[PDB]
Amino acid sequence: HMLRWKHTSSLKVANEPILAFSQGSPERDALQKALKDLKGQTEAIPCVVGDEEVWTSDIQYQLSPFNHAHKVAKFCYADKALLNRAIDAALAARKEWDLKPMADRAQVFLKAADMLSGPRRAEVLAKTMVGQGKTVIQAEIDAAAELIDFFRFNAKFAVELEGEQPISVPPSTNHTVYRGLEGFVAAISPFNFTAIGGNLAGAPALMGNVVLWKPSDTAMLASYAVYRILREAGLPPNIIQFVPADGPTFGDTVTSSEHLCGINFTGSVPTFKHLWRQVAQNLDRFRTFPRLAGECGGKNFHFVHSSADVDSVVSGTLRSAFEYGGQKCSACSRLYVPKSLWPQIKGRLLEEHSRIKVGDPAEDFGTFFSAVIDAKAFARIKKWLEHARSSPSLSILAGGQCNESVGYYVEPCIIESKDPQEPIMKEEIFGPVLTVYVYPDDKYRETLKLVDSTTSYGLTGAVFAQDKAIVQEATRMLRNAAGNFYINDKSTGSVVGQQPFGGARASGTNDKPGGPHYILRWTSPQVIKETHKPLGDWRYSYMQ
Amino acid sequence: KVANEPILAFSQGSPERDALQKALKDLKGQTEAIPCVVGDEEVWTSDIQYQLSPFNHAHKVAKFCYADKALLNRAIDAALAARKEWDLKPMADRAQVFLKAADMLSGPRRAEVLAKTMVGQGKTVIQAEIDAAAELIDFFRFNAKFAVELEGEQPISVPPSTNHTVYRGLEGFVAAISPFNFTAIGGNLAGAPALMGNVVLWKPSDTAMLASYAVYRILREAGLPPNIIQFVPADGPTFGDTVTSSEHLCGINFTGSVPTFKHLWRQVAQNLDRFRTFPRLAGECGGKNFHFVHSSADVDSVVSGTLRSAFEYGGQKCSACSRLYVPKSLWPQIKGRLLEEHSRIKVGDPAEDFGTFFSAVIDAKAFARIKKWLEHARSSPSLSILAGGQCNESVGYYVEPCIIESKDPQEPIMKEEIFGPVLTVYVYPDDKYRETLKLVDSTTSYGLTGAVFAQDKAIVQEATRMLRNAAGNFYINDKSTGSVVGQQPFGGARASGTNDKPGGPHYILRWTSPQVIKETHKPLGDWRYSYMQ
């Protein structure tokens, strides 16, 4: 045997525990200190290519959503020259990184996970709160738990993947080499989860790829924090290039490179489609066929059957619809309620609604949710609330007020539609706006079909019911309406390794980050067969 | 639990040789009228076509027809109507259809599918055996195993919630477009997605219609319900235009030319706003495969392995060796032996003469394309035909094996896929082996198969590293063809396709779109959090 293959080991990981932040607790004190550390501060965040900090003339600012007078970061957009230089340098670093043992690459992410878990936790939480407007618990489940879990679980999945080997029969030995993709990957991340940015850039890097990471403008502060932690954890230069940029410019540049091998995208449907078309237009230029991965949002439902637990419906719906101001691709924005339960549910929703506190998440930990992300989001939500007032089929039951004088503040809003096909039942708002449709109990089956057919999306959904037969029926009927389906729980809050996340229809390519197969999109395997005996004649015995 | 199907020896007086000879006699002089099949309906259009026996083109082995746009659209509608129930079936129940089909192919139907592959596609006994029997049987058994085991891949549950992954088929229909050169590939392209709960429009290759329909009928007989796989031969562009125009397209499983795959990819992109979801394109697109020889190589192995790789089935494999790199020190040996063995190759009727090494190429178009390359080899200042090159299409599409030396390592013939029995050899100076390895990697647009012959461990290690992306199926001291399911999952990148590795455990993942279900068994409680108090 001329090729010697070293045995592969296993890795033990578990989900990162969620902290409680009780009064007087070390994590609460640490977080308050980290928040104080950001008050009045603006970080100047450069593009990073290799180890070089680069500034262009295209200066941009990230504002604190709940206090937009506070510029939390000054950054810049990479120009096309810098993006191309970043590509060249990444490509020149790629072969060495790809040849590194999987275990050695995994170690970088395991180190980073430990840093985030401990000494850097308060920092990434605070930067996510101040820069993206998250409350303590929303930052904790995101910038700490989910990001840490992505890093640890993907490391486990990747190390274990090398143990997936083919059959060998004499006189030959077969081995699969899990190559990174030949070229570079473009990672394009969204504002709403710090963890997503880390995963979009980090997972391909783990698999031996090199990456140009364009982070979200409105999440720049936390994103750079994560980038620095990766570098400190031992990520070599030119493996992930930190290149904020104008979206169209970035897409134009990466899709014009013969060396593009993948785009890992989370964001709007039209932008993903645009990139898909650009790659198609440029097919004859590429050295290989680029792999596009996209997660693209939803119009997610909570469906209530007459047998539902009312209290669970209420609390689960309030959380799903309004946590982080409803700015989740998984947030519930349509609630279907049977007539029989509407009196109870409506009463309870309105009462609980009046107790929801909207405000500054850094100064007041009593805050349930804070301002929406930016002026553009605020303007869009304003238009939908105006639509609700104008539309004869819509009625605002609670909330409906807004104020952008200090932050981009929007009250949680509950709207009733008499029309199950109203535009507000179909279009993703990405704001704290829940629409309710009340259906006659005996039409629950017909209404389940409407849940399935009304929107273009297939991301998340929940059924609330205590009747087993009903749960089985609804589970069958709604099979393609939700890639993450919930029985008697809210439609948000997927946990890595427990609810791998993603959906189809217009919601994306459904590669299930958070599960064991996601990493397979970022490797292009090679199989090597070594034969240990001479071949013999070209003829076969049957020919004699 | 599954193992590879045994490859039979077909010795004189063996049961399999007797059975095959009978099956060949069963086809002599026969033309099968093969309809389009939509559900259980046998449909005929006026667009009548014929499949000819490559080595005796006067023999029309099948009459079939092209589905028109209207028929293809009906096939889509009927398939979509059957999909929900099929997808709702337990994975094991779907797997059973393929396991039954595999047993049928292994036993009572083996001679039939071999014979139809020999007569219809021009394969010899052993080429038909490794394809229509072993490879197809293995695809069915191994994919069934992988699929049943995939359901065991489940997430973590923590009280008071239970999490379960449902491996849904893709929502919509999948278009499967298969090539002439392996009966097994057609079975896999249509079969693998169907196994995973999809419904499929299968456009089989015109020039493999007889064997393709045989496989189709076996699947139906094995229990495949109506409208899960529609059997729809069609004009290539018409089929492509029709399926990419449907809002319900969810995947294309393709094996064929780069330009055709690129065209389909562009059609899907043009129509993105029409589709209910993002279609998944899988393409296996050929190669320009190498055998690289180091001075330490076992010459006998180089010779036999290269003759087989380059010439078996007339070189009509995406994995076939078409460029051979030889060090000057070994050239007199290798040249002498290749030319001597070349004279002993028998090209002829594989049904009538089991002495035949390989037979006619597939059709008139292939014959014409290969002739163009031979004419180029007779023209180019850097090329010399050392042996072979003769051709005669009077009775069958017969092209003799041809061995060419190129003085130019980057001549067009070193770069472009011919799909015929045409081997080009480049002789390199021993001291320039490293420079030449770089040329192996940089010369072509392809990344499919390649082999290094060497007995020096350090050389093998170096060559393996340098050629990491030059071949997705890489061979040390073996020929570049003949991948076996479960042993060498098959595929490569660069221009050679999307590399989804059919034959390995991950291929089926392209044909499922998972759903995760979380059920919580306790009431939720307050929406507030303790830290907020």
* Alpha-carbon span A318 to A414, nearest angstrom: 10
Annotated binding residue A428? yes
Q: Are A494 and A500 in contact (CB under 8 A)?
A: yes
Domain locations along chain A = 1-296+496-544, 297-495
Q: For A198, list phi and psi in degrees, rounded to 5.
A: -60, -40
By C-alpha distance, the chain B residue nearest A508 is B278
Q: Which amino acid is at B462?
A: E
Look up tokens 């060396």; give the residue: A259
CA B115, distance to chain mean position in Å, is 19
Solving technique for this entry?
X-ray
Please count the helices (runs of H) and the strands (runs of E) in chain A: 15, 23
Look up tokens 């045409």; give the residue: B422
Annotated binding residue B42? no
Q: At what angle do helices A310-322 and A342-353 cross, to 10 degrees?
A: 50
Q: Are B201 and B232 in contact (CB under 8 A)?
A: yes
Q: Which residues in B lie closer than 8 A to residue A283 (C-beta atoms)? A: 262, 265-266
- The four Cα atoms B36, B272, B248, B267 give a dihedral, to 10 degrees, of 0
By C-alpha distance, the chain B residue nearest A517 is B509
What beta strand segments (E) does A331-483 contain?
332-338, 394-398, 402-403, 409-410, 413-417, 433-439, 457-458, 460-464
* Alpha-carbon span B174 to B274, nearest angstrom: 16
With CB atoms and an 8 Å threshold, state whether A485 touches B277: no
* Alpha-carbon span A447 to B383, nearest angstrom: 72
Burial environment of residue B197 by CB neighbours within 10 A (0 to 12, 13 to 18, 19 or more): buried
Q: Which of B126, B460, B509 sits opposite A517 (nearest CB)?
A: B509
* Alpha-carbon span B49 to B32, nearest angstrom: 12
With CB atoms and an 8 Å threshold, state whether A273 touches B270: no
> Which residue blocks in A332-437 are alpha helix, DSSP H?
342-353, 375-390
Peptide bond into A236 cis (omega under 30): no
**What residues have CB less than 8 Å from B411, skipping those under 6 apart?**
B380, B382, B383, B424
Which one of A16, A146, A295, A416 is the catalytic residue? A295
Q: Are A538 and B341 in contact (CB under 8 A)?
A: yes
Q: Which amino acid is at A459?
A: L
Radius of gyration of chain B (CA): 25
Mutating which of A529, A531, A532, A541 best tests the B interface, going by the most B Cβ atoms within 10 A?
Answer: A529
Q: Are A350 and A385 in contact (CB under 8 A)?
A: no
Q: How many CB atoms lie within 10 A of CB A22?
A: 11
Residues in chain A: 544
Mind spelling out the 3-state secondary structure of B27-81?
HCCCCEECCEEECCEEECCCCEEEEEECCEEEEEEEEEECCCHHHHHHHHHHHHH
Q: Are A261 and A182 in contact (CB under 8 A)?
A: yes
Residue-wise over A462-491: b if at least 16 C-beta within 10 A, else e? bbbbeeeebbebbbebbbbbbbbbbbbbbb
Look up tokens 């680029």; give the residue: A290
Look up tokens 């592969």; give the residue: A8
Q: Between β-strands B249-255 and B173-177, what pairing exists: parallel, antiparallel or unpaired? A: parallel
Burial environment of residue B31 by CB neighbours within 10 A (0 to 12, 13 to 18, 19 or more): middle
The alpha carbon dihedral of A78, A80, A82, A85 has a sign of positive
Give contacts of B 85-114 with A, CB under 8 A. Answer: 87-88
Look up tokens 């849904």; give the residue: B168
Q: How many CB atoms lie within 10 A of CB B455?
A: 14
* Alpha-carbon span B345 to B307, nearest angstrom: 10
Which superfamily does CATH assign the domain made up of B286-484 to? Aldehyde Dehydrogenase; Chain A, domain 2 (3.40.309.10)
Q: Which of A2, A28, A489 sits opposite B518 (nearest CB)?
A: A489
- H/E run at residue A44: strand A43-45
Please count the helices (runs of H) and the strands (runs of E) in chain B: 15, 23
- Residue A301: strand pairing partners: A334, A461
CA B38, distance to chain mean position in Å, is 25
Extract the tokens encoding A514.
């958070």
CA B199, distance to chain mean position in Å, is 20
Q: Which residues in A lie closer than 8 A to residue B340 (C-beta atoms)? A: none
What beta strand segments (E) does B393-505 contain?
398-399, 402-406, 422-428, 446-447, 449-453, 473-476, 493-494
Q: Which residues in A lie closer than 8 A to residue B272 (C-beta atoms)? A: 273, 276-277
Residues in chain B: 533
Look up tokens 């082996």; give the residue: B433
What spatial distance separates the first Cα and last Cα of chain A, rounded to whole Å?
Answer: 33
Q: Between β-strands A394-398 and A413-417, what pairing exists: parallel, antiparallel or unpaired? A: antiparallel
Extract the tokens encoding A104.
């050695």
Q: Which residues in B lie closer than 8 A to residue A182 (C-beta atoms)? A: 469, 493-494
User: Which CATH class name applies to A297-495?
Assistant: alpha beta
- Breaks in chain A, after residue numbers (C to N greater than 2.5 Å): none
The answer to whether A367 faces chain B, any CB pair under 8 Å, is yes
Resolution in A: 1.7
Q: Which residues in A lie closer than 8 A to residue B307 (C-beta atoms)? A: 538
* Per-residue DSSP letter, A58: -
Mind spelling out the 3-state secondary structure of B422-433?
EEEEEEECHHHH
- Breaks in chain B, after residue numbers (C to N greater than 2.5 Å): none
* Cα dist from A15 to A116, B86, B313, B403, whole Å: 13, 36, 54, 61
Strand order in the sheet with B402-406: A172-180, A523-531, B473-476, B449-453, B289-293, B321-327, B422-428, B402-406, B383-388
**What residues have CB less than 8 Å from B173, skipping those under 6 apart?**
B76, B79, B80, B83, B198, B199, B200, B201, B243, B246, B248, B249, B250
With CB atoms and an 8 Å threshold, state whether B516 touches A520: no
The answer to whether A271 faces chain B, any CB pair under 8 Å, is no
Give contacts of B 14-33 with A, CB under 8 A. Answer: 17
Extract the tokens encoding A370.
């804070």
* Alpha-carbon span B91 to B154, nearest angstrom: 15
Catalogue the long-range contacts made by A103-106 (C-beta closer than 8 Å, 24 or more residues apart): A103/A8, A103/A9, A103/A159, A105/A158, A105/A205, A105/A206, A105/A207, A105/A208, A106/A11, A106/A155, A106/A158, A106/A159, A106/A206
Q: Which of B308, B494, B524 sits opposite A312 (nearest CB)?
A: B524
Look up tokens 């459904």; give the residue: A510
* 3-state secondary structure at position B122: coil
Q: Are B174 and B200 in contact (CB under 8 A)?
A: yes
Q: How many CB atoms lie within 10 A of CB A4?
A: 7
Residue (of A300, A356, A360) closest to A134 by Cα position: A360
Active-site residue set of B: 284, 318
Q: Are A74 and A63 in contact (CB under 8 A)?
A: no
Q: Which fold has domain A1-296+496-544?
A: Aldehyde Dehydrogenase; Chain A, domain 1 (3.40.605)
Peptide bond into A171 cis (omega under 30): yes
* Alpha-carbon span B417 to B446, nearest angstrom: 9
Q: Which residues in A lie closer than 8 A to residue B355 (C-beta atoms)? A: 543
> Which residue blocks in A282-341 are alpha helix, DSSP H?
310-322
* Per-residue DSSP letter, A300: E
Is A47 tagged catalytic? no
The three-point CA angle B471-B472-B474 to 5° equals: 65
Q: Between β-strands B249-255 and A260-266, what pairing exists: parallel, antiparallel or unpaired? A: unpaired
What beta strand segments (E) does B320-440 contain?
321-327, 383-388, 391-392, 398-399, 402-406, 422-428
**What residues have CB less than 8 Å from B361, skipping those under 6 apart?**
B54, B122, B314, B316, B367, B370, B397, B398, B399, B420, B421
* Alpha-carbon span B45 to B64, nearest angstrom: 9
What spatial distance separates the first Cα and last Cα of chain B, rounded to whole Å?
Answer: 57
Look up tokens 């060090």; give the residue: B327
Residue (of A352, A409, A347, A345) closest to A377 by Cα position: A409
Q: Are B439 and B288 in contact (CB under 8 A)?
A: no
CA B79, distance to chain mean position in Å, is 25
* Per-residue DSSP letter, A17: P
The answer to whether B493 faces chain A, any CB pair under 8 Å, is yes
Residue (of A150, A144, A140, A145) closest to A110 by Cα position: A150
Burial environment of residue A256 by CB neighbours within 10 A (0 to 12, 13 to 18, 19 or more): middle
The answer to whether B478 faces chain A, any CB pair under 8 Å, is yes
* Alpha-carbon span A513 to A502, nearest angstrom: 7
Give one word for B482, left, alpha or beta, with left for phi > 0 and alpha for psi -120 to 50: left
Q: Which fold has domain B1-285+485-533?
A: Aldehyde Dehydrogenase; Chain A, domain 1 (3.40.605)
- Residue A508: strand pairing partners: A295
Q: How many CB atoms lie within 10 A of CB B282?
A: 24
Radius of gyration of chain A (CA): 25
Annotated binding residue B260? yes
* 3-state secondary structure at position B411: coil
Residue (of B21, B185, B222, B9) closest to B111 by Cα position: B21
Q: Are B448 and B472 in contact (CB under 8 A)?
A: yes
